[PDB]
Structure 1
């Protein structure tokens, strides 16, 4: 007769009529819509991953190291070297992407009866994971320049007393880092925890927010990923930096053995080539400034970025423009900001192609006053 549908299943009412996350598939020539490193791993990196996976592969019949100690120590070491801030294993917690880190953090510190705040436009997954963990999502507005409006942000935290304060720095999708003084103002008033999502920290010209953990150990958690600068999006590894008591809190919410032996071994291999991979950052940053200068030169408004992408406009109709970029063979991202789109910084050839299409597409800019 009729196959059973989702309507026929006893799904939660609060999940009814919702669509799954994710843009539909597209294998088109130029993809600059997810903030991936465009430089594939080097042969030497691939060999080290492979050798580390081969080593662990002989004991696949056994459960992996539950607490992933060696990985966490290697993350501590990388980040110590990277920021001059002294960190060890006990300050680090890892999981399958930042997504899972955020989920774990909201289970421990948000969840039912609790709330989280974001300053918008910011990162799409923050409200989605809040929703997923049944944490109330609250919004306050960034400034007209897309940067933080710190008085508005502070007033909202004071008024609403959210359990979790989200701050993305460099922000996605505008690319702007939050100044440390703005950060400290929020930290001062946040009553629960603050999560500073430093997914783009490696690309940024200002100190890591890990420098502040010592100053705010009962509130501050910093998150990083291996998905962007580290060119390890395929391996799904994110981590957090905090006071050791936060690690104990993660042990209460994490699914035991969440990190596989394969994943732990591969990530360790990626970290042993950190210097090799992060050498790119220089070139990507250069390319991002070349793109920015060229778009500016052509009459586009471009938000200055501290990350590996660019938010730019102002289109009279941003989705129409996004469709035109598509017709030219360029996949960039519509992040739901009226009049703006977000273009990931790619290989030179890909950026050249983005710019060539933008030259033609500049005719759909809002006319000037």
Structure 2
């Protein structure tokens, strides 16, 4: 006997990560003495305009703009896409869930391509949808032929596709995306890490494909993960319904103000992106030399390593955490054989390699 819906009674929970203040208690270290490479956060922080704006919020006691129109105007200029195509969310996480709750009736089907962002499987479960897993190949590329086959057989309503992918950082070729867009399915391209690549954003494609959505975030390159602000490009025929169903005030005044302030400093954003891309190469080479790690090529701000040579990947992550360095390990069957190392400052890499050298 419970008021809870049946499909939620055995829901597998999401496995989130924990911030510095909580880690400090668990690890017995001050925050400045913890190297945190488990959530793809930008260790340089956001542009200095952000903390100046956050400290001078004029109307914290007034509800935010339900249309986030100031930020959407800035995103229209930034992206080259008109503001009528743009929604802002409490993170891109809000938009992932919003799409599912507006498109998937209970029992509808969604395609997922693991190993990938585990939020898609979680959100599908919360929304009562049924996941069709079409695994990526060993090089993390999409199996386009099998996607076509399952779409024909089972008529799923949507597919989420990360590029650069989390957790390996590989990109989806234009021709693969175009082949999938020919299918009668809603395609959600998640460009959370696109700024770390030389590939252009496909936001503009939504004007030519009424079955494409493109999602973006301020949480990674822009250094605003704590403030919860993301956005996306949507076809006009979809966005009109999403506006009606979207919660009025999930995008806070701090979120809108911080994102607008970050966009005032393109030089800072480019410089921190370039520093992280440079360190990614140095980190890759250092990890490759470790005998029990096999890193994969990446276009993001993280490097995935297969853990080899009989080394226990979970124990590796736990041992490193005890030494003060956090990397990411997932328990999902598709991911548990890897660890994912975010790119930080050069000194963060140096601490990680020092800790690796003292293992066992």
Distance 2:162 2:245 in 1: 23
Cα pair 1:301 1:313 within 8 Å, conserved: yes
Q: Which moved more, 1:205-214 or 1:220-229?
A: 205-214
1:1-369 to 2 correspondence within 5 Å?
9-18=2-11, 20-21=13-14, 22-23=16-17, 25-27=22-24, 28=27, 29-51=34-56, 53-54=57-58, 56-57=59-60, 60-61=61-62, 63-80=63-80, 87-189=81-183, 191-216=184-209, 218-299=210-291, 300-315=293-308, 316=310, 317-336=312-331, 337-360=335-358
What's the secondary structure of 2:203's corresponding residue?
helix
CA contact (8 A) 2:320 2:326 kept: yes
The residue that corresponds to 1:366 in the other structure is none
Structure 1 match to 2:31: none
Q: How many residues align?
A: 342
The CA deviation at 1:42 is 4.4
1:283 to partner: Cα distance: 0.6
Gaps of 5+ in 1: 1-7, 81-86, 364-369
Q: Following the alignment from structure 2 to structure 1, what is the Cα–Cα distance between the partners of residues 205 and 49? A: 35
Q: In the TM superposition, what is the alpha-carbon distance from 1:360 to its structure 2 partner?
A: 4.9
- Residues 110 and 163 of structure 1 are in contact (CA less than 8 Å); yes or no, is this contact kept in structure 2? yes
> Residue 11 and residue 360 in structure 1: after superposition, are their counterparts in 2 closer, same or farther (change >3 A)?
same
What stretches of structure 2 of length at least 5 have no aligned partner? Answer: 28-33
Cα distance in 2, alignment partners of residues 254 and 219 from structure 1: 19
Displaced runs of 4+ in structure 1, greater than 4 A? 17-20
Task: Give how far 1:128 is off.
Answer: 1.0
Residue by residue over 1:14-68, the C-alpha shift from the partner in whole angstroms, topping out at 9 and shown as x without a partner, is 22254643246422422111111111234443213434x22x44xx34x432212
